């Protein structure tokens, strides 16, 4: 069993000081600095995690392809497909009701 | 002698409020024209737990009536409100639970909470969990109404003070018996440093006026005048009665 050491000058097991021990040539084990776990986007109404958008750090979406950070739909990337269907029905049905309620009832 | 712990509390060094995870200030929106001559519609986005208080807080979202954008408020939840509900505030609001109305448009015998003691001051009375105030009478002569405070006292207010219809949520909070010293320790997580209270008689003569001698006792009457100087004002102040009641 090969025992390793911290490479950087951090000495405490904080969230940002996560390490992974991998093997290298000759039976030597080195230290890799592993990333933190992020959260994905959430629907602004129901707070459910959206599909089609990866769970990566906020600055990493700048490196993402322009089509890999949003879904091709009205309110894509901010609202679930169910969050949007009810939006359309609300917009249409209420406007229809306001046409028979007022405007020569 | 020394300074008693009551004196040290007024300095506010370790007795400051532990308000770091608190949500904000729970109050009505500022009074304007649309709250005085019309109604505004608010949407209850969420109901949340504010540390250090027993009642939940509602995140209500009004549209800005004068500019383009939103206006995020933080109300005290009336018992019954749910997410996605619509509430209306203004002089013309309906008498439903959760709606904010001037205290003069509410009928006699109605129940309101988060009442304003002075118009536009965004809520003073009846804010704790399960508490409420009842409207007693109106006086159209000088536009004043009477309400009964949760302590049984009767107070007269201007008829245009706002109030939320209903009962503050979280009722019955104090009916559950605390059982462990640990549970009482956790009660003051978002409050002041006051919990483990040492009896004055167990102290020494320097620390407290009760600090006794060879037998733990007070030695002098524990009912004091209101005009006692700080430091010796310990016990019961201006007490008109004592003992057990029958």
């Amino acid at each position: 069993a090969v025992r390793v050491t911290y490479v950087r000058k951090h000495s405490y097991n904080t969230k940002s000081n996560g390490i992974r021990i991998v093997k290298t040539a000759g039976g030597n084990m080195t230290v890799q600095h592993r990333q933190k776990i992020s959260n994905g986007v959430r629907c602004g109404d129901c707070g459910c995690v959206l599909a089609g958008i990866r769970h990566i750090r906020p600055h990493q979406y700048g490196w993402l392809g322009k089509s890999k950070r949003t879904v091709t739909r009205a309110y894509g990337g901010v609202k679930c497909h169910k969050c949007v269907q009810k939006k359309i029905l609300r917009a249409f049905l209420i406007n229809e009701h306001n046409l028979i309620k007022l405007a020569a009832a | 002698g020394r300074r008693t712990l009551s004196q040290r509390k007024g300095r506010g060094s370790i007795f400051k409020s532990r308000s770091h995870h608190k949500l904000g200030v729970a109050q009505h929106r500022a009074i304007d024209f649309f709250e005085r001559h019309s109604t505004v519609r608010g949407l209850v986005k969420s109901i949340e737990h504010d540390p250090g208080r027993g009642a939940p807080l509602a995140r209500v979202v009004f549209r800005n009536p004068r500019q383009y954008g939103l206006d995020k408020e933080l109300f005290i939840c009336a018992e019954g409100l749910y997410s996605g509900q619509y509430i209306y505030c203004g002089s013309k609001a309906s008498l439903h639970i959760g709606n904010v109305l001037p205290i003069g448009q509410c009928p006699e015998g109605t129940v309101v909470c988060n009442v304003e003691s002075k118009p536009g001051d965004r809520g003073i009375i009846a804010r704790a969990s399960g508490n409420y105030a009842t409207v007693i009478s109106h006086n159209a002569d000088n536009e004043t109404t009477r309400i009964r405070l949760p302590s049984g006292a009767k107070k007269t207010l201007k008829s245009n003070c706002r109030a939320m219809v209903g009962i503050i949520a979280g009722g019955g909070r104090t009916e559950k018996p605390i059982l462990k010293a640990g549970v009482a320790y956790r009660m003051y997580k978002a409050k002041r440093t006051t919990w483990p209270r040492v009896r004055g008689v167990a102290m020494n003569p320097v620390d407290h006026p009760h600090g006794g001698g060879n037998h733990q006792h007070v030695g002098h009457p524990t009912t004091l005048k209101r005009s006692s100087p700080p430091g010796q004002k310990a016990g019961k102040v201006a007490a008109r009665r004592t003992g057990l009641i029958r």
Partner: protein
């Protein structure tokens, strides 16, 4: 499993029989499920003191500290309803 100490058997024998009997009523009602006033499913569980969430129905309701609706908060909803009707008509 137990004769007459239902849920407060976790407290063992160290808080007084009466204090364990009193808390038993609250602790049963605090963890119990309630009928959801919108979807009518027994799927409402307490989140925090005074907050109740309908699990399979996507709603949050403000209620009592340990019960979804209190007695005091139940007669108020009817009292306001009666006054609202009277105010509208004459």
């Amino acid at each position: 499993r137990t004769k007459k100490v239902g849920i407060v058997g976790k407290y063992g024998t160290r808080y007084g029989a009466s204090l364990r009997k009193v808390i038993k009523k609250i602790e049963i009602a605090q963890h119990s499920k309630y009928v959801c006033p919108f979807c009518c499913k027994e799927a409402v569980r307490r989140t925090a003191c005074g907050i109740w969430e309908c699990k399979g129905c996507k709603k949050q309701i403000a209620g009592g500290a340990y019960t979804l609706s209190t007695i005091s908060g139940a007669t108020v909803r009817s009292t306001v309803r009666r006054l609202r009707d009277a105010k509208n008509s004459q």
